[PDB]
Ligand binder design. Structure first.
Ligand SMILES: *Cc1cc2c(cc1C)nc1c(=O)[nH]c(=O)nc-1n2C[C@H](O)[C@H](O)[C@H](O)COP(=O)(O)OP(=O)(O)OC[C@H]1O[C@@H](n2cnc3c(N)ncnc32)[C@H](O)[C@@H]1O
Length: 491
């Protein structure tokens, strides 16, 4: 194959393309392709199509948990070498979003953020918690954070893509042009093509965020309050709503020390009622405001907005920081992980959506029993609104209810733990999924990983035939993102 970029066989390049953040799969490619642009990528795709066995996997920033960006004896396309290929801002008169920016599928969101803000005072309006992820990587899944209840996930905030299809075609698509490909690729787990450019929506960048954390002991009250907040009329409430479960104890990694937002206000556990469960709940809120706003005016606004919430008195923590610093807040957690050596150990992360109707049951068995001593990392749980998620996309969410929850068990492995430790974590993730399937819980995995056809058929449900149809159209040989394990390469 003749390309402008570099082709690397074996060595450190292959080692890296055979690793991901999951830290549980090592699958080496024949070669790593470092493309200059869409032509190098379609070349890689066409090479694989001519061969008997080659497959092609785009690699974003290697944040997958279960080998989804790996290609056993295939070609891994390191998208980072395309990270700077696009940066064009345009305006929108159609109301809603102010503007859009064209960015590479290989750009990291952290870089997109910094450049939009510094050059234009604009920024995307829907995020992930962690910004060391690629545009094409998150758009291939959903891209979820505390703004999604208001604007939908990142797949709801893109209006055009350039895609290199599994046929090797370079195609521009949108709601109006090649719409089937557009909707297929969004949330499509890399199955239908490689995103080389995305037109991402922009709004004016806020100056500041008031970041608030308040604590609940009662899951019913926590979820009622959170659902109420995400259901409020546009711009009458907060601009970010998340939640998390924490251990009722002093464990610095799992317990109440994880709650405070600055070193000068600590968690006082004597404010907790005597009857508290094994775990407690934190509602996390963000209010955007202007540099010019009077502090008393903002204080009064926040007291009004928080004033009906039923959190435990004396367990309210807040800080104010620039908007960019708020969006990059998880850098602090990355630093704690590198310090305790758990950034480089395996991460058997479990991510799923649960209907509003079943989140109570999930809390009862999962949070209050299975992981009641924590998982050594975040246990996130917060509500989302179905109205913001377009069902034409490949994304798969729970079957019933206008509100559903996202849940994340962000497991970390202490560096002196046995390999049996990681096995036990994986086994417990499986035990949770089984418990869901057995008890008819309306759940769907996010970043799903299954190895059997019957599990994928169950996952896609009434959208399985559509998924298969889209595959037959855009990657009939099944060469793309084989590590998702949904389709096996054609013989
Ligand atoms: C590591 C991690 C992940 C993460 C996170 C925090 C950490 C530390 N926080 C998230 C969050 O707050 N909200 C959210 O929705 N996701 C969060 N993630 C998970 C993350 O989205 C996934 O890891 C995702 O895969 C993006 O990561 P990355 O950009 O590194 O992409 P990848 O893992 O290498 O590839 C994922 C799949 O998509 C295919 N792929 C990669 N690039 C493309 C392009 N450009 N076009 C089409 N497909 C692509 C890969 O082959 C793989 O199948």
């Amino acid at each position: 194959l003749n390309i402008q970029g570099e082709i690397l066989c074996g060595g450190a390049a292959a080692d890296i393309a055979g690793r991901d953040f999951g830290g549980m799969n090592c699958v080496k490619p024949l070669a790593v392709v470092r493309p200059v642009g869409p032509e190098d990528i379609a070349g890689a795709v066409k090479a694989a199509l001519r061969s008997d066995k080659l497959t092609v996997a785009a690699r974003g920033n290697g944040h997958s948990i279960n080998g989804q960006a790996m290609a056993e004896g295939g070609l891994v396309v390191d998208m980072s070498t395309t990270a700077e290929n696009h940066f064009e801002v345009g305006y929108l008169s159609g109301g809603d979003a102010t503007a859009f920016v064209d960015v590479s599928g290989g750009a990291l969101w952290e870089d997109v953020l910094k450049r939009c803000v510094s050059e234009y005072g604009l920024a995307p309006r829907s995020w992930t918690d962690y910004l060391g992820l690629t545009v094409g990587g998150t758009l291939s899944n959903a891209g979820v954070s505390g703004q999604a209840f208001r604007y939908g996930p990142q797949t709801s905030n893109v209006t055009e893509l350039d895609v290199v299809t599994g046929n090797g075609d370079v195609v521009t698509c949108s709601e109006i042009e090649n719409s089937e490909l557009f909707f297929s690729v969004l949330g499509g787990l890399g199955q239908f093509g490689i995103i080389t450019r995305a037109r991402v929506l922009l709004q004016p960048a806020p100056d500041m965020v008031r970041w608030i954390r308040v604590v609940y002991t009662e899951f019913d009250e926590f979820t009622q309050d959170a659902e109420w907040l995400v259901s409020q009329k546009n711009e009458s409430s907060f601009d970010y709503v998340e939640g998390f479960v924490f251990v009722n104890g002093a464990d610095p990694v799992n317990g109440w020390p994880t709650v405070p937002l600055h070193p000068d206000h600590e968690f006082d556990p004597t404010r907790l009622p005597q009857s508290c469960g094994s775990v407690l709940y934190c509602l996390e809120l963000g209010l955007h405001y202007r540099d010019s706003d009077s502090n008393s005016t903002i204080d009064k606004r926040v007291e009004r907005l928080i004033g009906r919430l039923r959190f435990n008195e004396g367990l309210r923590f807040e800080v104010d920081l620039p908007y960019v610093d708020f969006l990059l807040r998880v850098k602090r957690s990355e630093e704690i992980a590198k310090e305790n050596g758990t950034w480089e150990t395996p991460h058997p992360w479990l991510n799923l959506f649960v209907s509003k109707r079943d989140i109570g049951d999930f809390n009862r068995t999962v949070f209050k029993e299975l992981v009641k001593n924590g998982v050594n990392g975040p246990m996130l749980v917060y509500p989302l609104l179905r109205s913001r998620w377009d069902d034409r996309t490949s994304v798969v969410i729970p079957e019933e209810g206008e509100i559903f929850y996202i849940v994340a068990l962000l497991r970390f492995v202490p560096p002196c733990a046995k390999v049996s430790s990681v096995e036990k974590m994986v086994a417990q993730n499986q035990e949770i999924v089984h418990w869901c399937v057995k008890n008819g819980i309306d759940y769907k995995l996010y970043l799903p990983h299954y190895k059997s056809q019957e599990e994928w058929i169950r996952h896609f449900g009434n959208r399985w035939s559509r998924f298969v149809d889209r595959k037959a159209m855009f990657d009939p040989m099944a060469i793309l993102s084989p590590g998702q394990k949904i389709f096996n390469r054609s013989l």
